[PDB]
Amino acid sequence: MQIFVKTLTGKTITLEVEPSDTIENVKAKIQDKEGIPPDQQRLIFAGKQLEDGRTLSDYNIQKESTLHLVLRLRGG
Template sequence: MVLITEPTHIQVFLKNEKGQTHTYEVVSGETVTQFKAKVQNKEGVPADQQRLIHEGKQLDDRKKLEDYGVRNLSTIHLTLRLRGG
């Protein structure tokens, strides 16, 4: 017997540097890179300039959101990477 489960959809909040909060729907198993693409489409911030923070930890592109304990109704903070000059 094989049990096939549908991916779980959850809502997370993204709070930007302006204090604005937007809601995103993500799927269980979604990677940080996939989430950054959604943020780029909605916020207009290129993925390579995004720094995402959840519960004090910076999110690594190679990991999944769930690796950081992101659950339904979690808040992720968006800050911008400073460019060297």
């Protein structure tokens, strides 16, 4: 499948993945394409945060779906 990833800056990149791929593998591809280390990446899809050890198919991520890179912060 082909999916999209929206980075922290707002840029949209295109990834070629498989629904059986794990979240770590998708984060590694994001690192290969944009240079973002996987320990800094937090992925959101359809409001759900993707946790490590899981695959895309666990979240029903289909073709041309969009993942979002988000910062997670503590409030004041």
